[PDB]
Amino acid sequence: VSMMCNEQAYSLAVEKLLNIQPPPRAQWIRVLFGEITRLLNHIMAVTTHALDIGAMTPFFWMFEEREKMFEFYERVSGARMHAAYVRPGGVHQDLPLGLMDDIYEFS
Amino acid sequence: KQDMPPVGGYGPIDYKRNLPRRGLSGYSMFAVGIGALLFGYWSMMKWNRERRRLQIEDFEARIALMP
């Protein structure tokens, strides 16, 4: 599930060794996607629990809203889920024009 | 120079959690239940007693003939 919460535990585990603080624009993105993957676990942690139990309809009622969020991942990094996006040198590249009237539209 | 952060336009949406759309509570319920229930019993005694009147009418034709 986690794509930006993993690699958050790696670059921050490497930048301490290398005597680097990351630049300040970069830190506002690691908190943004680092506080967007929690809106992927805490959707999957309830629905998949509610499927073993055996309820059908809260599995389909929330993943159809989940699709509005993978368009972000594809727009910023490289792919559907597995993105080599956080680097040890901060963020790979800047997120393009958009994604600020989209997230505010989403949230 | 073409970076993101907009000047204005924000909400937010709530973190609130409420939808108390009640709902006819507190002794208003059990009141539509009892009165409509006796209404169904009130519909009785005007049909079963009425069919009982026809029931003696049905047995009447049997007893009048058969000598």
PDB file of C-alpha atoms in Angstrom:
ATOM      1  CA  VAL A   1       0.000   0.000   0.000  1.00  0.00           C
ATOM      2  CA  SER A   2       2.523   2.596   1.131  1.00  0.00           C
ATOM      3  CA  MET A   3       4.473   4.172  -1.716  1.00  0.00           C
ATOM      4  CA  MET A   4       5.602   7.391  -0.081  1.00  0.00           C
ATOM      5  CA  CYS A   5       5.650   6.208   3.521  1.00  0.00           C
ATOM      6  CA  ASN A   6       8.050   3.576   2.463  1.00  0.00           C
ATOM      7  CA  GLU A   7      11.114   5.361   1.011  1.00  0.00           C
ATOM      8  CA  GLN A   8      10.336   7.956   3.657  1.00  0.00           C
ATOM      9  CA  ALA A   9      11.927   5.542   6.117  1.00  0.00           C
ATOM     10  CA  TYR A  10      14.904   5.122   3.818  1.00  0.00           C
ATOM     11  CA  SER A  11      16.039   8.549   2.656  1.00  0.00           C
ATOM     12  CA  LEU A  12      15.618   9.834   6.197  1.00  0.00           C
ATOM     13  CA  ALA A  13      17.654   6.785   7.242  1.00  0.00           C
ATOM     14  CA  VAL A  14      20.367   7.845   4.786  1.00  0.00           C
ATOM     15  CA  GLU A  15      20.424  11.662   5.007  1.00  0.00           C
ATOM     16  CA  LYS A  16      21.451  11.458   8.676  1.00  0.00           C
ATOM     17  CA  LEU A  17      24.579   9.581   7.628  1.00  0.00           C
ATOM     18  CA  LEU A  18      25.388  12.170   4.980  1.00  0.00           C
ATOM     19  CA  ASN A  19      25.060  15.415   7.031  1.00  0.00           C
ATOM     20  CA  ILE A  20      22.307  16.885   4.871  1.00  0.00           C
ATOM     21  CA  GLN A  21      19.202  18.700   5.623  1.00  0.00           C
ATOM     22  CA  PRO A  22      16.765  18.541   2.693  1.00  0.00           C
ATOM     23  CA  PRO A  23      15.647  21.836   1.109  1.00  0.00           C
ATOM     24  CA  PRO A  24      12.477  23.423   2.500  1.00  0.00           C
ATOM     25  CA  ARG A  25      10.180  23.137  -0.536  1.00  0.00           C
ATOM     26  CA  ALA A  26      10.959  19.403  -0.625  1.00  0.00           C
ATOM     27  CA  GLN A  27       9.870  18.863   2.985  1.00  0.00           C
ATOM     28  CA  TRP A  28       6.358  20.142   2.304  1.00  0.00           C
ATOM     29  CA  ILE A  29       5.839  17.419  -0.288  1.00  0.00           C
ATOM     30  CA  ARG A  30       7.063  14.534   1.866  1.00  0.00           C
ATOM     31  CA  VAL A  31       4.472  15.514   4.435  1.00  0.00           C
ATOM     32  CA  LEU A  32       1.801  15.880   1.751  1.00  0.00           C
ATOM     33  CA  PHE A  33       2.247  12.430   0.217  1.00  0.00           C
ATOM     34  CA  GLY A  34       3.331  11.120   3.600  1.00  0.00           C
ATOM     35  CA  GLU A  35      -0.095  12.239   4.783  1.00  0.00           C
ATOM     36  CA  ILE A  36      -1.863  10.842   1.771  1.00  0.00           C
ATOM     37  CA  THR A  37      -0.793   7.192   2.054  1.00  0.00           C
ATOM     38  CA  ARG A  38      -2.598   7.055   5.397  1.00  0.00           C
ATOM     39  CA  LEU A  39      -5.705   7.703   3.339  1.00  0.00           C
ATOM     40  CA  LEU A  40      -4.898   4.458   1.535  1.00  0.00           C
ATOM     41  CA  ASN A  41      -4.152   2.112   4.414  1.00  0.00           C
ATOM     42  CA  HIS A  42      -7.053   3.359   6.534  1.00  0.00           C
ATOM     43  CA  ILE A  43      -9.423   2.752   3.644  1.00  0.00           C
ATOM     44  CA  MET A  44      -8.032  -0.694   2.906  1.00  0.00           C
ATOM     45  CA  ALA A  45      -7.732  -1.605   6.600  1.00  0.00           C
ATOM     46  CA  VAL A  46     -11.514  -1.371   7.063  1.00  0.00           C
ATOM     47  CA  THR A  47     -12.991  -2.656   3.778  1.00  0.00           C
ATOM     48  CA  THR A  48     -10.777  -5.745   3.579  1.00  0.00           C
ATOM     49  CA  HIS A  49     -11.586  -6.431   7.207  1.00  0.00           C
ATOM     50  CA  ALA A  50     -15.244  -5.962   6.281  1.00  0.00           C
ATOM     51  CA  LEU A  51     -14.853  -8.508   3.486  1.00  0.00           C
ATOM     52  CA  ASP A  52     -13.488 -11.335   5.531  1.00  0.00           C
ATOM     53  CA  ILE A  53     -16.434 -10.589   7.786  1.00  0.00           C
ATOM     54  CA  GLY A  54     -18.506 -10.829   4.635  1.00  0.00           C
ATOM     55  CA  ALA A  55     -20.042  -7.461   3.862  1.00  0.00           C
ATOM     56  CA  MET A  56     -20.007  -6.830   0.115  1.00  0.00           C
ATOM     57  CA  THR A  57     -21.143  -3.262  -0.460  1.00  0.00           C
ATOM     58  CA  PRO A  58     -18.591  -1.247   1.609  1.00  0.00           C
ATOM     59  CA  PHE A  59     -15.885  -2.827  -0.530  1.00  0.00           C
ATOM     60  CA  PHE A  60     -17.277  -1.358  -3.748  1.00  0.00           C
ATOM     61  CA  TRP A  61     -18.575   1.875  -2.217  1.00  0.00           C
ATOM     62  CA  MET A  62     -15.079   3.105  -1.291  1.00  0.00           C
ATOM     63  CA  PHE A  63     -12.684   1.780  -3.932  1.00  0.00           C
ATOM     64  CA  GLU A  64     -14.715   3.632  -6.550  1.00  0.00           C
ATOM     65  CA  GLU A  65     -13.772   6.792  -4.679  1.00  0.00           C
ATOM     66  CA  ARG A  66     -10.196   5.493  -4.324  1.00  0.00           C
ATOM     67  CA  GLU A  67      -9.675   5.786  -8.120  1.00  0.00           C
ATOM     68  CA  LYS A  68      -9.695   9.613  -7.767  1.00  0.00           C
ATOM     69  CA  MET A  69      -6.338   9.273  -5.997  1.00  0.00           C
ATOM     70  CA  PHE A  70      -4.167   7.066  -8.209  1.00  0.00           C
ATOM     71  CA  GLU A  71      -4.444   9.757 -10.885  1.00  0.00           C
ATOM     72  CA  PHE A  72      -2.222  11.777  -8.553  1.00  0.00           C
ATOM     73  CA  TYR A  73       0.472   9.069  -8.398  1.00  0.00           C
ATOM     74  CA  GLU A  74       0.549   8.761 -12.166  1.00  0.00           C
ATOM     75  CA  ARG A  75       0.588  12.520 -12.673  1.00  0.00           C
ATOM     76  CA  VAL A  76       3.542  13.129 -10.369  1.00  0.00           C
ATOM     77  CA  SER A  77       5.972  10.239 -10.416  1.00  0.00           C
ATOM     78  CA  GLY A  78       6.017   7.402 -12.897  1.00  0.00           C
ATOM     79  CA  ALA A  79       3.399   4.694 -12.647  1.00  0.00           C
ATOM     80  CA  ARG A  80       0.287   3.359 -10.977  1.00  0.00           C
ATOM     81  CA  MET A  81       1.604   2.435  -7.526  1.00  0.00           C
ATOM     82  CA  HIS A  82       5.275   1.555  -7.228  1.00  0.00           C
ATOM     83  CA  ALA A  83       7.116   4.816  -7.650  1.00  0.00           C
ATOM     84  CA  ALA A  84      10.831   5.319  -7.131  1.00  0.00           C
ATOM     85  CA  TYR A  85      10.019   8.888  -6.230  1.00  0.00           C
ATOM     86  CA  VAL A  86      11.665   9.893  -2.954  1.00  0.00           C
ATOM     87  CA  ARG A  87      15.437   9.926  -3.438  1.00  0.00           C
ATOM     88  CA  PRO A  88      18.234  10.482  -0.915  1.00  0.00           C
ATOM     89  CA  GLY A  89      18.629  13.927  -2.450  1.00  0.00           C
ATOM     90  CA  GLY A  90      15.120  14.965  -1.583  1.00  0.00           C
ATOM     91  CA  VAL A  91      12.318  14.921  -4.094  1.00  0.00           C
ATOM     92  CA  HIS A  92      13.029  13.674  -7.613  1.00  0.00           C
ATOM     93  CA  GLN A  93      11.289  16.473  -9.509  1.00  0.00           C
ATOM     94  CA  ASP A  94       8.635  19.112  -9.084  1.00  0.00           C
ATOM     95  CA  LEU A  95       4.981  18.316  -9.407  1.00  0.00           C
ATOM     96  CA  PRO A  96       3.546  19.973 -12.524  1.00  0.00           C
ATOM     97  CA  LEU A  97       0.990  22.732 -13.013  1.00  0.00           C
ATOM     98  CA  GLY A  98      -2.166  21.581 -11.343  1.00  0.00           C
ATOM     99  CA  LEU A  99      -2.367  19.347  -8.272  1.00  0.00           C
ATOM    100  CA  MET A 100      -3.341  22.274  -6.030  1.00  0.00           C
ATOM    101  CA  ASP A 101      -6.812  22.963  -7.355  1.00  0.00           C
ATOM    102  CA  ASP A 102      -7.133  19.176  -7.617  1.00  0.00           C
ATOM    103  CA  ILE A 103      -6.238  18.137  -4.085  1.00  0.00           C
ATOM    104  CA  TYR A 104      -8.347  20.983  -2.710  1.00  0.00           C
ATOM    105  CA  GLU A 105     -11.056  19.765  -5.079  1.00  0.00           C
ATOM    106  CA  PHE A 106     -10.501  16.206  -3.845  1.00  0.00           C
ATOM    107  CA  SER A 107     -10.298  16.879  -0.126  1.00  0.00           C
TER     108      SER A 107
ATOM    109  CA  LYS B   1       9.047  30.810 -11.610  1.00  0.00           C
ATOM    110  CA  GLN B   2       6.021  28.698 -12.524  1.00  0.00           C
ATOM    111  CA  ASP B   3       5.486  26.970  -9.195  1.00  0.00           C
ATOM    112  CA  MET B   4       2.331  26.054  -7.351  1.00  0.00           C
ATOM    113  CA  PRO B   5       1.154  27.699  -4.156  1.00  0.00           C
ATOM    114  CA  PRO B   6      -2.052  29.622  -4.816  1.00  0.00           C
ATOM    115  CA  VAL B   7      -2.925  32.946  -3.265  1.00  0.00           C
ATOM    116  CA  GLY B   8      -6.392  32.106  -1.999  1.00  0.00           C
ATOM    117  CA  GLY B   9      -9.467  29.935  -2.182  1.00  0.00           C
ATOM    118  CA  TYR B  10      -9.840  27.459   0.664  1.00  0.00           C
ATOM    119  CA  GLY B  11     -12.515  25.784   2.741  1.00  0.00           C
ATOM    120  CA  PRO B  12     -11.828  23.483   4.355  1.00  0.00           C
ATOM    121  CA  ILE B  13     -14.186  20.566   4.476  1.00  0.00           C
ATOM    122  CA  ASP B  14     -15.210  19.577   7.957  1.00  0.00           C
ATOM    123  CA  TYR B  15     -13.699  17.077  10.299  1.00  0.00           C
ATOM    124  CA  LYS B  16     -17.161  17.064  11.883  1.00  0.00           C
ATOM    125  CA  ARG B  17     -19.245  13.949  12.441  1.00  0.00           C
ATOM    126  CA  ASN B  18     -22.998  14.460  12.838  1.00  0.00           C
ATOM    127  CA  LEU B  19     -26.276  13.553  11.125  1.00  0.00           C
ATOM    128  CA  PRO B  20     -28.958  13.485  13.856  1.00  0.00           C
ATOM    129  CA  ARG B  21     -31.998  13.269  11.584  1.00  0.00           C
ATOM    130  CA  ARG B  22     -34.428  11.903  14.173  1.00  0.00           C
ATOM    131  CA  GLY B  23     -36.910  10.669  13.541  1.00  0.00           C
ATOM    132  CA  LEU B  24     -40.058  10.530  15.690  1.00  0.00           C
ATOM    133  CA  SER B  25     -38.543   9.200  18.902  1.00  0.00           C
ATOM    134  CA  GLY B  26     -39.706   9.084  22.496  1.00  0.00           C
ATOM    135  CA  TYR B  27     -43.234   7.593  22.953  1.00  0.00           C
ATOM    136  CA  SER B  28     -44.337   8.880  19.530  1.00  0.00           C
ATOM    137  CA  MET B  29     -43.302   5.403  18.519  1.00  0.00           C
ATOM    138  CA  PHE B  30     -45.358   2.532  20.006  1.00  0.00           C
ATOM    139  CA  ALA B  31     -48.327   4.857  19.372  1.00  0.00           C
ATOM    140  CA  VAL B  32     -48.757   4.238  15.654  1.00  0.00           C
ATOM    141  CA  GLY B  33     -48.156   0.550  16.343  1.00  0.00           C
ATOM    142  CA  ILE B  34     -50.922  -0.091  18.867  1.00  0.00           C
ATOM    143  CA  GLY B  35     -53.681   1.944  17.201  1.00  0.00           C
ATOM    144  CA  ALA B  36     -53.184   0.400  13.768  1.00  0.00           C
ATOM    145  CA  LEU B  37     -53.031  -3.044  15.384  1.00  0.00           C
ATOM    146  CA  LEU B  38     -56.441  -2.654  17.045  1.00  0.00           C
ATOM    147  CA  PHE B  39     -57.662  -1.148  13.767  1.00  0.00           C
ATOM    148  CA  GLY B  40     -57.024  -4.556  12.228  1.00  0.00           C
ATOM    149  CA  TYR B  41     -58.939  -6.171  15.060  1.00  0.00           C
ATOM    150  CA  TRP B  42     -61.627  -3.550  14.498  1.00  0.00           C
ATOM    151  CA  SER B  43     -61.786  -4.775  10.900  1.00  0.00           C
ATOM    152  CA  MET B  44     -62.671  -8.140  12.418  1.00  0.00           C
ATOM    153  CA  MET B  45     -66.162  -8.793  13.913  1.00  0.00           C
ATOM    154  CA  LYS B  46     -67.588  -7.030  10.850  1.00  0.00           C
ATOM    155  CA  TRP B  47     -66.337  -9.745   8.503  1.00  0.00           C
ATOM    156  CA  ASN B  48     -66.070 -12.949  10.542  1.00  0.00           C
ATOM    157  CA  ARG B  49     -69.443 -12.321  12.175  1.00  0.00           C
ATOM    158  CA  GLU B  50     -70.676 -11.375   8.707  1.00  0.00           C
ATOM    159  CA  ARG B  51     -69.295 -14.613   7.272  1.00  0.00           C
ATOM    160  CA  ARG B  52     -70.800 -16.437  10.266  1.00  0.00           C
ATOM    161  CA  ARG B  53     -74.171 -15.039   9.156  1.00  0.00           C
ATOM    162  CA  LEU B  54     -73.514 -16.489   5.713  1.00  0.00           C
ATOM    163  CA  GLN B  55     -72.310 -19.705   7.335  1.00  0.00           C
ATOM    164  CA  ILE B  56     -75.724 -20.385   8.861  1.00  0.00           C
ATOM    165  CA  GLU B  57     -77.178 -19.366   5.482  1.00  0.00           C
ATOM    166  CA  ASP B  58     -75.002 -22.020   3.833  1.00  0.00           C
ATOM    167  CA  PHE B  59     -76.068 -24.729   6.287  1.00  0.00           C
ATOM    168  CA  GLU B  60     -79.685 -23.548   5.913  1.00  0.00           C
ATOM    169  CA  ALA B  61     -79.972 -24.921   2.370  1.00  0.00           C
ATOM    170  CA  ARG B  62     -78.709 -28.321   3.523  1.00  0.00           C
ATOM    171  CA  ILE B  63     -81.311 -28.689   6.273  1.00  0.00           C
ATOM    172  CA  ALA B  64     -84.285 -27.329   4.289  1.00  0.00           C
ATOM    173  CA  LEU B  65     -84.037 -30.100   1.725  1.00  0.00           C
ATOM    174  CA  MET B  66     -83.192 -33.740   2.574  1.00  0.00           C
ATOM    175  CA  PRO B  67     -86.425 -35.159   3.421  1.00  0.00           C
TER     176      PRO B  67
END
